[PDB]
Symmetry: D2
C-alpha cells in the first residue's frame, strides 16, 4: 500500500496543473492531490526578480483569454481592481531603422517606395495563385508565401519565425495556424500603401490586463492560494522522480509513494516518459522537437524615453539583434521595477563601457525583457548572449550608447517552445493515446506539446478539461480541436456551475 | 407555492426529453422530473400498430449513432442480442422504370445511354466550374447543381427534395449539409458509367440495428422504463398547457403546477411560445417553416417478392407516386407484421378492386411504409392520399395490381420536418437566446428545429448535453456545432462516467 | 461603246485610291484611270485653310506607318528633310483638373488617393477574374472592363469612347481592337501608383513626322503629282454619278462614260450602292453605322502657353466640353498658322466677350483643332457647336477667358468614322462578296468600313493591295486580316520591286 | 564572266523548285533557269519501281492542298479525269490487336473498359488543369499530355511520335502544331465512350486524289514537262557543286558556271552551306536536326484481304513493329502494282520462309509501303530492317504467315524529316536571314526546314512565294506564317492572274 492514495493525482502546478486542481476542487467529488518540484507554483508562467528589484516573466507574457472559466479563476485569485493594470495590445516590428506597427503587411507604407513595389508585386503573384489554388499549404513556409508573397514574407515572417522557432519555416507544419485560407489580403495591403496609411491592430477594445504585483507569476501564486493547502505538495517534497504506470504509483524524491486512479501529468512529456522508465515512450518523446528560451532582462535608469513610449512587445526579424521579441516590461506595471527613490549604482553603459561613477543613484527606472531562442539547429553562445542582447538594444535604437544599465538578468529555460514540426502530430498520436490507455492524461505546453493551445489560458483549460473528461465525460476540446476553442468565446464552463448551485440549496 | 418543485423540469419524453432524463438520472444531483402528454414515451420515434397487427414507425426510422452515450442507453434498454436485428443500409432510387442503387450518381449506367451522356456532360460542366470556384453555394439548389451538374440534379436530388421538404430547393440553405465542398466526383461517376458498373454504398460494415419488437417505439419505452417512475408523469396528467416563464412555473392540464429552476423543453418551440403566452416569441416562431408527414402503411399478403428482396428504404423523385420515401418495414423485423399462420381477410387488391373471396387466409405477410410530405406549398388531400399511395405502389412496380392488401394505415403528423429554409437561422438565433435568457433550454427536432441534428441520436444527445450544460457547464455541441458532432464518433460521455465510479468507491 | 475604256478604274483620290493609282502606275501593265469629284486629292486626309491663314486637317491626323511601301511613296512625294517635322507622340487625358499622360492607367497617381484606391481595387478584381477567364469579351465594353476594371474604365475609356463613337461601348464589338488578351497589367499600374510615377508612352523612339507645309493634305497632293496627269480626272469632271455593274460602265457628272474590267471603288460603300441603283446593296449598306465628324478650329494669339507646351493631341472623357479630342495643331508645323509678323484683329476673347480693340495686331499665333462626333444617338447643334467648343476650351483650362481668338473654323464631315458595331461584320460579309462577284473592289475607310485598318497608311495599302490582288493574285491582307498587318512590319512590298529592276536591265 | 547568266536561278526541281519555276514561267519577266542533280524532277515527291513492277512513293504521300495555285498547276499537268483516283482519307491506329479509327481519342471505345477508364481519368486531369492553365505548353510532350491526358498520350501520340521523329517528344517544340489551345475535348471523347461509338474523321467530303500512273512522282514529271526545256538542266549536267554567294555564281559538276541576281535554293540548307564553303553557315546548319527515312515496300500476292479493305494509311505506336506508318499503296491506284495477269514467282512467305518452287504465278497483287525513321538517337540496322518490317506486318496482322511476297523494296533517304526540335527556330533565325542578305532564298522541306509547311503543296508554294517576293514584293506567308496559310483556303494566287489576262489584250 502506498503512503498516500487519491483518485486523481496532478503532477505539476503550472497553469495546467492548477487548472486541473481548480476543477477538481470545484467538483469536490473524487479525492485529489497536486505536486510540484517548485515551492512556488506557476511553471513557465512564473516570475523572477533580480537582486536590484527588477521583475522578469519567462519572456513576454500577455494574456488573451478564450475562456470564461479562466477569467473566473483569475478574478477569484486577484479580485480587486488595483490588482491589475489594463493596456492596449501595442506591438511593432523593427524593420530597416523603423518601428512598423503590427500587422506588418498593413504598414509597409513606411518602407522605401521601391521596396513597397517589390512587396506588392510579390503579393499580386500570391493573390493570382491563391485564385486557382486547390491544395492546402503543407509547410509553415508555404503558408507564409501564400499569405504574404515573397517580398513581404522575406521581410518579416520568414526571418522572424526562424529567430523564434529556431528551425526553418520549411520544417514546420501550418495546420497549427488555423483553418483560414492561405490567401493574401491584397486589397487591404495595397489600400494602405496607396493611402500612405499606417494602422496597428489595437485600440480601446484590443487590450490585456497584467497583474499589478508579482509579475505574471503573481496570478498563479494567487490561484494556488485558493486551493486547500493540505491537498498540495510544492517543493523538494513534491518532486516526482518515478512513475509506475502499471501499479498506478508515483514516487517522490523524498521516497513518498502516491497511488492514483487517474493521473494528470503536466510535466514535459519527454520527462514523464523518463520518470516512467518506459523505453518505448522515451524513444517516441525524443522524436518531438523543442527550442530553449533565453530570457534576458535589462534594467535601465531614466524616465521612459519618448522613442519607447507605450510600446508593449516588439518583433525583430532582422540580424542586428539576437532576440526575436522585446517587451517593455516596465509598461506592464509600475511594480515590475524599483520605485524612483530606489538608489542603485550603474553597472554598465549600454555601449558596454564602465560608468563614470560607481555611486548609487536614484531612478526612475524602466525595463526591457528580451527573448532569444536556441535549438540543435540554432546554437547560442551562452557566454556572450547578455552582451549581444545589450548590443542588440543599441543597434535597434532601443537603448542609447549612454543609457545606464542598473540591473541585468539572464536565465535559460530548456523547454521553452514545443515546435510544430512537420513530424509533431505523427509522433503525438503515438504518445498521447499510449499514455491515455494507462489512465495518464498528459496535458499542457509540454504535457501535450501543442503550441497553438500553449498559452496560459489554453494550458489552464487543458487541465480543467482533462479533469472534466476524467470525471464528467467531457470532450477535451482544447487538446484535440485548437481551431474550435480558439475560434469562439468559451462561456459554458464556469467556476460556479449548476452542480455547485443545486448542491448548496 | 406550486404543487411540485424540482431543480430541472423536462417537458416531453421523446428521445430528447428521455436523453435529458437519462443524464439527470445518471448524475443524480439536482432534483428533476419529466412530463409528457402521451402515456407512451417516444414522440416521433414511437410506433403504431393497425387492428390487423402491422406495425408502423412514424415513417422510415433507421438508426445511425454518432455517440457512445446513445449506444450505452440503447444497450441498457435492450441488452439481449435477440432484442435486435442487424441489416445492411440498402437503399435505391426509383427512376425511369429502374431501381437505382444509392448513391444515384454512381449508378446512372442503368439509365439510357443518351441520358448518361447528358448527365456526364452536366457533371463535366460542374467539375470545371468547381475547379475555379471561390464562393460557397448559398442555397440547397446551388449546392446540388455544383455537386451533380444539371442533368443529374434534375433526375434525382432536385425533384426528390421538393417531394420531401415540400418547398423548392432554391428556398433552402445548404450549410446543414456540412462543410464538404460542393464538387463532383467526376472520375467515380464516369468510371462506373464506363464499366457499366452498379454499386450501392452498403456492405457488411454499413449496417443498422432495428428493434426485434415494438418497432422503433420499443427502444424508447424500454429506455423510459429505466427511469424512476415516480419522477415521470405521462398521459393526460403530464400534458403541459401553460408555461409562466417569469415565475418559472408550468401548469398541467389537470391543474397541477410545477416549479422549476431550469426548464428543458422538447415540445415544438412554436407550441412553447404559445404555452408561454409570449407574443414576441409566438410571432418569431411562426416565422419558422415546417412540413407535416403523412405516414401510409400497407400490409401485403405473400412472401417477400423477388423484386423487393433485401431493399430497406427507397427514394422516389418522380411524380408517378405521391410518397417521397418507401420502407420495406417487414424487412426490419419479422415482428413488425403478423406471423405467417395468422389469418387475415383481403381488404382490396392493389389496383383497388375487391378480392374474389372475403374469407380470412393465412400469410406470410410483408409491409410497406410510405411517407408523404405536406406544406402550405404542397397540399395533401387527406381523403384520397391512401388510395393515391396505393396507386403509387402499382405505378412504381412495388405492387402488382393483383397483390392482396390486408391492412392499411394512415396518420398525419403535424410537425414532421423542421425545414432548413434560408431564413431558419436568422429566426432561430432570435428565438433560442430569448428562451435561454429565461433559463429555458428549448431542444429537440422541433425544440431547436435543426434537421441536421434531428435524428434520434442527435435528439437524445440534445437532451443529454442540455442537462450537462445546466449542471456541469458542458458545451452544447450537438445544438451549436452539427458539423462537429457529425464528423466524429463522440466517445467521451458514457452512461457510466468517472463521477459515478468514484462516488460508488 | 463607252467614251473611255480602261482595264482598272479607280474611283476616289483619297489615300486609298491614290494607293491603287500608285501601284497601278508602278506596275505599268493594265491600263487605268483615277477619278475624283474633288479637284484636290486627299479625301478625309485633306486640309482646309481659314481666311486668316490657319490650316486644319480633318481632325487630328497623326501618321503611324505599318508599311514600307507607304513610306516609299511618302518619301518620293516629299523627299527633302525640310519637307517634314518630327515630333514625339505626346498625348494626355484631361481628367479632374489634370492633364494625365497617356496611357491613362499608368498615370492615375495624379488623381486623388481615395480614387486611386477605387481604381486599383477594380483592377485587382479584373486581374483576379482574368486569371480564371475562359471566354473572349463579346463587346467593346466588356473588353474595356476586363482590361481596366470598373473604376478606371469609368474614368476614361468608357465615357471617352461614347464621346468618340457616338454609340455606347456596349453596342460595339471588340475584335477590331486586336488579338491581345483582355487582361490588366496590374503590376505596371500599381507600380506607378506606388512610385508616384507619371510616364507618357513617348520618347525619342516614339515619334511621328508631319508635313512642313499644306498640312496632312500636302502629302496627298504631292503623291498625286507623281501620277501621269492624263490618267487622272479630278473635279466636277471626275464626279461619278452612276455605276452599272452589269455592264461594267461608270457615268460621270458631265456625261462621260468609262468602261472598266475591274473597279477599285473608294467612295463610301453606301454611296456606291446608291450609284449602282442596286436596292439589295442599298438595303445592306443602310444597316452599316457611322458617325459624322465636326472639326472645329480655333486660332489663338500669343506665343504658345506653358500649360500647353509640347502637347500634341488630347483626350476628353469628361462632360465639360463637347469635343472628344483636341490637337495642338500649331505644334505640328509652324506653317499651319500665319507667321508672327502677320497682323490679325481679335475676333473674340475665349469667354465670348468683344476685344477692347478691333485693330489688327501681330502674333505669334498658336492653334487648336477639335473634334466633335455626331450620330442619330448623339445630335450636334451646328449653330452652337463652335461656341460650345470655345466654352469647352475654357472649361478644360486650355484657354484662359482672356485668350484672344483670331480665327475660327467649323466643318461637318458626314462620313467621319465607320463604327465597329456588333452588327458591322455580319453586314459587311454580305456586302463585299456581292461587290466582289461583280469585279468591284470596294476598299477604304468607308469603301470597306473597318476602322482598325482605317488610317492613312491602311487606306493607301488597301488600294495598293486591291491592285496587287487584281494583277498579281496577292492576298488582301489589310482588308481581311487587320491583326496580321498591324502586328508586323510590312517591308516586302516596295515602290521599286524586282519586277521593275529586272525590266530596266 | 560565267557561262550562263540569269536573273533568277532555281536550284532543285522537287516541288519547291518546280513551284518557283512555274511562277517564273507564268510571270515571264525576269530570265531564269532551274537545275537538278537528278534527270527526273520530283525530289522526295518522286516514285521508284521494283524490278517486279511495284511502285513506291517515298513513304506515304497524300495530297491535301491549301492553295488554289497548287491545284491549278496539278490540273494543268494532269488535266484528264482518268489521270487521277479519288479516295477517302481513311486511317487507323493499330492498338492492342485492334484497328482504331483516327482520331484515336474519339475511338477508344474499342479498347477494353479498364483502358477506357484509365484514358478518361487521365483526360479529366488534363481538362481540370487546362481550366486554370495560363501558360502555353513549351514542348511537344507537354502539348500532347495537355491535349490528351496521360493514359491516352501513352497509348498513341507519345510512342507513335517517337517512332516518327526519332527524337523524344520532350525534345521538340510545339508551336509547329498551330495556335489552337492545348486543351482536351473531354465531352466529345467521353461521349463516344459512353455511346460505344466509333467514328473516323473521313467521309464523302474528306478525300484526296492520287495520280493514276507513276505514283506521286508522275505529278512532278508532268509539272516539269510544262516548263520550257531549255530553261531546265536536269541530271549530272545540273548538279550544283559550288555556290559562290559573294560573286553570285554557281558552279555545276561539269564545270558550267551560272551567274545570278537572285538564288532560290531548294537543296537541303546544310548541303547549301557546304556548297557555299561557308564554315560559319556549316556550323549553324549542323545544329539543325533531321531524321532519315527508310522506305520499305512489300508486294503481296492475292486479292486485297477483307481485314485490309479500304484502309489508306495506318499508324503504329506499338513496339511490335519498327515502322511508324503503313500505306496500302495498292489502294491508291491499280497502276501502283502489276495487273492480275502478270506472272511473278513467290520470293518469300511473310513468315520469312523461302517458298517451294520458282513457279511464276499470276496475281492479283496488293502492296504495302512502310516507313521507318532513323537518327543519331535512333539507329536502324539496314541489313535487317526489311525482315523486321515483314515480321512487323505479321505481328500487326497485316500479313498472314502464309501470305506470298512477290516483291521487296528498301531505300534509305538521308534527309527525310526536318525536326521541330526546341532549338530549330533559334538556329533558323541565324541562318535564313544571313542567306537572305546574300540574295539567297533558301526554301523547301529542307531548304527552310519547317515540317509544318513541309508537304507538297507547302513546298511548291514556298517556291512560288519566293519568286513572288523576288519579283512582286509579295509576303512569304507560307515561310513565315504556317498558321496563316494552313488556317485558310488560299485562293488569291492563280496560274492565270490578272497580269496575264491583261497582257493578252
Amino acid at each position: 500500500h502506498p503512503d498516500i492514495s487519491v483518485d486523481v493525482l496532478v503532477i505539476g502546478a503550472g497553469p495546467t496543473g492548477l487548472g486541473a486542481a481548480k476543477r477538481l476542487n470545484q467538483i469536490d467529488g473524487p479525492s485529489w492531490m497536486i505536486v510540484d518540484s517548485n515551492e512556488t507554483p506557476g511553471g513557465l508562467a512564473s516570475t523572477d526578480v533580480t537582486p536590484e528589484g527588477f521583475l522578469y516573466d519567462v519572456g513576454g507574457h500577455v494574456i488573451f483569454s478564450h475562456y470564461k472559466y479562466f477569467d473566473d479563476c483569475l478574478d477569484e485569485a486577484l479580485p480587486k481592481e488595483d490588482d491589475w493594470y489594463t493596456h492596449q495590445r501595442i506591438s511593432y516590428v523593427r524593420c530597416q531603422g523603423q518601428w512598423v506597427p503590427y500587422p506588418f503587411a498593413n504598414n509597409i507604407s513606411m518602407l522605401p517606395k521601391e521596396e513597397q513595389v517589390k512587396c506588392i508585386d510579390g503579393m499580386i503573384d500570391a493573390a493570382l495563385e491563391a485564385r486557382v489554388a486547390n491544395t492546402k499549404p503543407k509547410t509553415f513556409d508555404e503558408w507564409i508565401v501564400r499569405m504574404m508573397g515573397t517580398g513581404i514574407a522575406d521581410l518579416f515572417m520568414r526571418p522572424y519565425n526562424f529567430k523564434v522557432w529556431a528551425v526553418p519555416t520549411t520544417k514546420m507544419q501550418c495546420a497549427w495556424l488555423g483553418e483560414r485560407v492561405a490567401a493574401p489580403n491584397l486589397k487591404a495591403v495595397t489600400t494602405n500603401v496607396i493611402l500612405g496609411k499606417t494602422a496597428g491592430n489595437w485600440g480601446p477594445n484590443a487590450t490585456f490586463r497584467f497583474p499589478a504585483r508579482g509579475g505574471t507569476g503573481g496570478i498563479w501564486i494567487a490561484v494556488a492560494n485558493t486551493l486547500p493547502k493540505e491537498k498540495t505538495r510544492f517543493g523538494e517534497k513534491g518532486k516526482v522522480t518515478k512513475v509506475n504506470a502499471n501499479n498506478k504509483t508515483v514516487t517522490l524524491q523524498d521516497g513518498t509513494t502516491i497511488g492514483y486512479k487517474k493521473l494528470v501529468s503536466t510535466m514535459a512529456v519527454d520527462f514523464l516518459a523518463e520518470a516512467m522508465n518506459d523505453q518505448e515512450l522515451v524513444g517516441l518523446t525524443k522524436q518531438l522537437f523543442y527550442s530553449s528560451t533565453h530570457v534576458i532582462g535589462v534594467g535601465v535608469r531614466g524616465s521612459r524615453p519618448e522613442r519607447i513610449g507605450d510600446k508593449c512587445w516588439l518583433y525583430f526579424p532582422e540580424d542586428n539583434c539576437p532576440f526575436y521579441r522585446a517587451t517593455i516590461f516596465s509598461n506592464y506595471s509600475p511594480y515590475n521595477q524599483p520605485e524612483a527613490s530606489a538608489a542603485l549604482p550603474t553597472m554598465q553603459l549600454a555601449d558596454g563601457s564602465r560608468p563614470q561613477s560607481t555611486e548609487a543613484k536614484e531612478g526612475p527606472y524602466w525595463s526591457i525583457m528580451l527573448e532569444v531562442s536556441e535549438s540543435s539547429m540554432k546554437p547560442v553562445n551562452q557566454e556572450t548572449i547578455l552582451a549581444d542582447c545589450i548590443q542588440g538594444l543599441v543597434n535597434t535604437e532601443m537603448l542609447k550608447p549612454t543609457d545606464e544599465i542598473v540591473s541585468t538578468y539572464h536565465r535559460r529555460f530548456d523547454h521553452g517552445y514545443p515546435t510544430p514540426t512537420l513530424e509533431r502530430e505523427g509522433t503525438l498520436t503515438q504518445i498521447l493515446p499510449k499514455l491515455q490507455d494507462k489512465d495518464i492524461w498528459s496535458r499542457g505546453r509540454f504535457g501535450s506539446w501543442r503550441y497553438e493551445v500553449g498559452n496560459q489560458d489554453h494550458s489552464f483549460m487543458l487541465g480543467v478539461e482533462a479533469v472534466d473528461n476524467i470525471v464528467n465525460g467531457a470532450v477535451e476540446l482544447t487538446l484535440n480541436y485548437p481551431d474550435f476553442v480558439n475560434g469562439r468565446q468559451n462561456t459554458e464552463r464556469r467556476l460556479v456551475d449548476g452542480a455547485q448551485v443545486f448542491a448548496k440549496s
